[PDB]
Design an enzyme around this catalytic site. Structure first.
Site, PDB file in Angstrom:
ATOM      1  N   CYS A  13       5.089   7.386   7.049  1.00 32.59           N
ATOM      2  CA  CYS A  13       6.507   7.532   7.486  1.00 32.59           C
ATOM      3  C   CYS A  13       7.179   6.159   7.564  1.00 32.59           C
ATOM      4  CB  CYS A  13       6.402   8.180   8.864  1.00 32.59           C
ATOM      5  SG  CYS A  13       7.975   8.014   9.747  1.00 32.59           S
ATOM      6  N   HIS A  27       0.837  -1.245   0.000  1.00 33.54           N
ATOM      7  CA  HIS A  27       0.000   0.000   0.000  1.00 33.54           C
ATOM      8  C   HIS A  27       0.856   1.275   0.000  1.00 33.54           C
ATOM      9  CE1 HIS A  27       0.629   0.975   4.472  1.00 33.54           C
ATOM     10  NE2 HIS A  27       1.767   0.513   3.945  1.00 33.54           N
ATOM     11  N   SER A  84      -3.799   6.170   9.015  1.00 32.08           N
ATOM     12  CA  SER A  84      -3.015   7.440   9.034  1.00 32.08           C
ATOM     13  C   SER A  84      -3.755   8.528   8.255  1.00 32.08           C
ATOM     14  CB  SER A  84      -1.689   7.103   8.355  1.00 32.08           C
ATOM     15  OG  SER A  84      -0.616   7.555   9.171  1.00 32.08           O
ATOM     16  N   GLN A  92      -7.349  -2.640  10.077  1.00 29.64           N
ATOM     17  CA  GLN A  92      -8.583  -2.572  10.908  1.00 29.64           C
ATOM     18  C   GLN A  92      -9.831  -2.848  10.056  1.00 29.64           C
ATOM     19  OE1 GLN A  92      -7.460  -0.627  14.303  1.00 29.64           O
ATOM     20  NE2 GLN A  92      -8.929   0.966  14.051  1.00 29.64           N
ATOM     21  N   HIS A 137      -4.674   5.915   1.727  1.00 24.54           N
ATOM     22  CA  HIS A 137      -3.673   4.985   1.132  1.00 24.54           C
ATOM     23  C   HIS A 137      -4.242   4.300  -0.117  1.00 24.54           C
ATOM     24  CE1 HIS A 137      -2.142   4.948   5.456  1.00 24.54           C
ATOM     25  NE2 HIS A 137      -3.233   5.718   5.487  1.00 24.54           N
TER      26      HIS A 137
END
Length: 120
Positions: free
Chosen positions: A70, A12, A111, A88, A114
């Site tokens: 990151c 990803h 985050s 998840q 993606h």
């Protein structure tokens, strides 16, 4: 140990946007937040990113290293394997729902935004 398959492997990338903190816990100059990709816009930026990555066998690895989480920037390639662990409801259901081809339908979660990719 197992009789059939289950866990889900996958790769990803991650784009930059509003998110829920700053930008993406990356190495940037705290300086001052500026106007750029945001929640909505984020999906728009990916709408074309998935499209572009969809048509045209462009690249991905090196891109998965820069425009990626990151930690992912270090692992722009892929995660590897993770059944009911890691990821998840959103991503997991993504790699569990798609299978190379559509490249996930915009993965905005964890985050920020993606785009998964397994075989291909």
């Amino acid at each position: 140990h197992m009789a059939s398959r289950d866990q889900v492997k996958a790769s990803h990338i991650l784009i930059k946007h509003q998110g829920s903190r700053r930008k993406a816990s990356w190495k940037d100059p705290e300086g001052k937040i500026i106007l750029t990709t945001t929640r909505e816009a984020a999906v728009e930026q990916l709408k074309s990113i998935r499209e572009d990555i969809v048509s045209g066998k462009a690249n991905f690895e090196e891109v998965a290293t820069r425009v990626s989480d990151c930690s992912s920037a270090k692992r722009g390639g892929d995660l590897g394997s993770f059944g009911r662990g890691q990821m998840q409801k959103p991503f997991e259901e993504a790699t569990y729902a798609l299978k190379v081809g559509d490249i996930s339908d915009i993965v905005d979660t964890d985050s920020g935004v993606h785009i998964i990719k397994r075989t291909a």
